[PDB]
XYZ file of N, CA and C in Angstrom:
267
model
N 152.893 -27.773 -75.656
C 152.149 -26.502 -75.436
C 150.972 -26.571 -74.486
N 150.939 -25.634 -73.755
C 149.698 -25.709 -72.664
C 148.868 -24.425 -72.652
N 149.831 -23.299 -72.267
C 149.270 -21.843 -72.205
C 150.164 -21.105 -72.609
N 149.850 -20.008 -73.636
C 150.719 -18.951 -74.058
C 150.778 -17.707 -73.250
N 152.266 -17.380 -72.903
C 152.179 -16.248 -71.912
C 152.935 -15.095 -72.525
N 152.037 -14.070 -73.039
C 152.572 -12.812 -73.601
C 152.209 -11.449 -72.923
N 152.993 -11.202 -72.054
C 152.755 -10.027 -71.203
C 153.920 -8.972 -71.071
N 153.719 -7.738 -70.535
C 154.834 -6.605 -70.418
C 155.394 -6.782 -68.979
N 155.274 -7.981 -68.297
C 155.747 -8.149 -66.853
C 157.194 -7.477 -66.488
N 157.395 -6.326 -66.169
C 158.698 -5.720 -65.407
C 158.425 -5.948 -63.780
N 159.553 -6.652 -63.006
C 159.589 -6.737 -61.635
C 158.497 -7.157 -60.782
N 157.384 -7.792 -61.459
C 156.174 -8.123 -61.044
C 155.666 -9.593 -61.667
N 155.419 -10.491 -60.869
C 155.492 -12.083 -61.169
C 154.387 -12.673 -60.301
N 152.797 -12.819 -60.773
C 151.984 -13.832 -60.114
C 152.110 -15.346 -60.249
N 152.525 -15.986 -59.036
C 152.387 -17.577 -59.130
C 151.109 -18.041 -58.223
N 149.903 -18.317 -58.607
C 148.791 -18.969 -57.823
C 148.525 -20.304 -58.319
N 147.945 -21.055 -57.474
C 147.767 -22.411 -57.466
C 148.752 -23.284 -57.307
N 149.341 -23.372 -56.090
C 150.575 -24.259 -55.577
C 150.019 -25.487 -54.942
N 150.778 -26.396 -54.375
C 150.273 -27.651 -53.939
C 150.683 -27.550 -52.437
N 149.690 -28.336 -51.603
C 149.671 -28.005 -50.150
C 150.903 -28.405 -49.187
N 152.106 -28.959 -49.457
C 153.145 -29.013 -48.799
C 154.482 -28.126 -48.897
N 154.180 -27.002 -49.773
C 155.273 -25.834 -49.945
C 154.618 -24.785 -48.870
N 155.858 -23.693 -48.355
C 155.494 -22.750 -47.554
C 156.252 -21.455 -48.118
N 156.333 -20.414 -47.348
C 157.063 -19.099 -47.765
C 158.405 -19.347 -48.245
N 159.226 -20.054 -47.487
C 160.729 -20.034 -47.728
C 161.088 -21.053 -48.941
N 160.215 -21.837 -49.315
C 160.505 -22.913 -50.445
C 160.189 -22.061 -51.853
N 159.288 -21.129 -51.884
C 158.932 -20.458 -53.348
C 160.186 -19.417 -53.652
N 160.910 -19.209 -52.396
C 162.171 -18.302 -52.387
C 163.381 -18.940 -53.353
N 163.626 -20.292 -52.623
C 164.971 -21.082 -53.360
C 164.651 -21.712 -54.597
N 163.506 -22.218 -55.103
C 163.187 -22.824 -56.326
C 163.263 -21.620 -57.583
N 162.739 -20.492 -57.302
C 163.043 -19.297 -58.348
C 164.499 -18.521 -57.968
N 165.099 -18.816 -56.980
C 166.210 -17.908 -56.828
C 167.341 -18.481 -57.425
N 167.261 -19.677 -58.381
C 168.306 -20.244 -58.990
C 168.704 -19.243 -60.156
N 167.847 -18.724 -60.788
C 168.180 -17.577 -61.913
C 168.054 -16.235 -60.926
N 167.221 -16.026 -60.125
C 166.915 -14.625 -59.457
C 166.527 -14.538 -58.005
N 167.487 -13.851 -57.186
C 167.176 -13.550 -55.708
C 165.860 -12.657 -55.457
N 165.490 -12.515 -54.300
C 163.917 -12.265 -54.265
C 163.640 -10.733 -53.220
N 162.828 -9.915 -53.747
C 162.452 -8.593 -52.837
C 161.654 -8.837 -51.619
N 160.265 -9.244 -51.651
C 159.181 -9.241 -50.755
C 158.194 -10.295 -50.972
N 157.584 -11.329 -50.042
C 156.719 -12.337 -50.429
C 155.372 -12.237 -49.739
N 154.381 -12.275 -50.459
C 152.926 -12.410 -49.777
C 152.264 -13.698 -50.275
N 152.254 -14.781 -49.353
C 151.618 -16.174 -49.427
C 150.767 -16.497 -48.126
N 149.566 -16.282 -48.105
C 148.675 -16.562 -47.019
C 148.673 -18.070 -47.086
N 148.488 -18.725 -45.675
C 148.559 -20.226 -45.763
C 147.794 -20.583 -44.315
N 146.962 -21.758 -44.468
C 145.985 -21.949 -43.201
C 146.551 -23.004 -42.323
N 146.548 -22.884 -40.925
C 147.209 -24.044 -40.035
C 146.368 -25.266 -40.045
N 145.225 -25.485 -40.586
C 144.475 -26.679 -40.639
C 144.903 -27.699 -42.009
N 144.789 -27.079 -43.255
C 144.953 -27.821 -44.565
C 146.193 -27.309 -45.147
N 146.729 -26.121 -44.856
C 147.950 -25.447 -45.777
C 147.259 -24.895 -47.109
N 146.040 -24.700 -47.358
C 145.420 -24.246 -48.546
C 145.899 -22.671 -48.773
N 146.055 -22.376 -50.235
C 146.519 -20.840 -50.502
C 145.232 -20.131 -51.190
N 144.196 -20.938 -51.508
C 143.080 -20.387 -52.270
C 143.406 -19.650 -53.708
N 143.976 -20.167 -54.501
C 144.134 -19.819 -56.040
C 144.981 -18.693 -56.271
N 145.694 -17.979 -55.180
C 146.423 -16.800 -55.491
C 147.676 -16.662 -54.513
N 148.720 -16.061 -54.960
C 150.157 -15.654 -54.375
C 150.839 -14.722 -55.176
N 151.278 -13.525 -54.548
C 152.106 -12.682 -55.358
C 153.653 -12.754 -55.108
N 154.627 -12.483 -56.126
C 156.157 -12.680 -56.033
C 156.939 -11.523 -56.746
N 157.762 -10.557 -55.989
C 158.421 -9.505 -56.615
C 160.056 -9.917 -56.875
N 160.455 -9.910 -58.135
C 161.867 -10.290 -58.500
C 162.957 -9.022 -58.039
N 164.310 -9.309 -58.112
C 165.305 -8.302 -58.026
C 165.832 -7.525 -59.375
N 166.192 -8.507 -60.583
C 166.405 -7.602 -61.776
C 165.205 -7.733 -62.805
N 165.195 -6.611 -63.771
C 164.106 -6.530 -64.697
C 164.275 -7.187 -66.141
N 165.551 -7.782 -66.441
C 165.595 -8.575 -67.761
C 165.387 -10.077 -67.344
N 165.882 -10.624 -66.224
C 165.566 -11.987 -65.695
C 164.169 -12.345 -65.369
N 163.430 -11.384 -64.823
C 161.930 -11.352 -64.932
C 161.200 -11.916 -66.090
N 161.330 -11.361 -67.241
C 160.923 -11.994 -68.523
C 161.291 -13.341 -68.628
N 162.594 -13.729 -68.945
C 162.972 -15.210 -69.206
C 162.578 -16.123 -68.154
N 162.366 -15.837 -66.913
C 161.570 -16.895 -65.968
C 160.088 -16.962 -66.208
N 159.451 -16.063 -66.371
C 157.535 -16.220 -66.487
C 157.469 -16.840 -67.840
N 158.112 -16.539 -68.868
C 158.015 -17.294 -70.068
C 158.364 -19.048 -70.084
N 159.291 -19.197 -69.261
C 159.716 -20.563 -69.054
C 158.605 -21.256 -68.028
N 157.746 -20.529 -67.540
C 157.053 -21.200 -66.074
C 155.528 -21.394 -66.309
N 155.175 -21.404 -67.439
C 153.781 -21.907 -68.145
C 153.893 -23.490 -68.015
N 154.901 -23.963 -68.733
C 154.852 -25.496 -68.928
C 155.516 -26.372 -67.813
N 155.983 -25.559 -66.512
C 156.799 -26.004 -65.366
C 155.660 -26.549 -64.359
N 155.691 -27.780 -63.964
C 154.826 -28.245 -62.825
C 155.691 -28.307 -61.435
N 154.955 -27.948 -60.277
C 155.318 -27.802 -59.065
C 155.019 -28.974 -58.143
N 155.713 -30.127 -57.732
C 155.236 -31.276 -57.013
C 154.048 -31.888 -57.572
N 153.962 -32.131 -58.964
C 152.870 -32.646 -59.810
C 151.603 -31.639 -59.604
N 151.798 -30.515 -59.448
C 150.412 -29.332 -59.597
C 150.939 -28.494 -60.637
N 149.838 -27.772 -61.402
C 149.946 -27.073 -62.438
C 149.769 -25.541 -62.069
N 150.818 -24.635 -62.293
C 150.827 -23.228 -61.709
C 150.235 -22.333 -62.891
N 149.211 -21.302 -62.599
C 148.980 -20.374 -63.539
C 150.038 -19.224 -63.370
N 150.712 -18.435 -64.346
C 151.663 -17.582 -64.121
C 151.447 -16.455 -65.091
N 151.125 -15.105 -64.428
C 150.700 -13.947 -65.455
C 151.093 -12.474 -64.671
N 150.994 -11.306 -65.254
C 151.519 -9.890 -64.677
C 150.569 -9.462 -63.710
N 150.920 -8.722 -62.602
C 149.978 -8.097 -61.694
C 149.958 -6.509 -61.426
N 149.167 -5.971 -60.535
C 148.992 -4.606 -60.256
C 149.942 -4.399 -58.909
N 150.420 -3.024 -58.797
C 151.090 -2.770 -57.522
C 150.728 -1.392 -56.910
């Protein structure tokens, strides 16, 4: 156990705190294995590829949303730990 995720997240998924060799297209295909994707907002800088603690991710279907974020607390991305929670739209 690391961090318990209990929220009402329908169609809205926050992933912030990702490692500095991923880009836009890579966060599409690693989550598309259960769920294909609507729209992606991930700012990235051309000197270090820093994301500054924050990125937004919208899914296609509303059941699949819930089963992915509850599995995503204990999952590490390229040896870095991602904080995963519900957002505003």
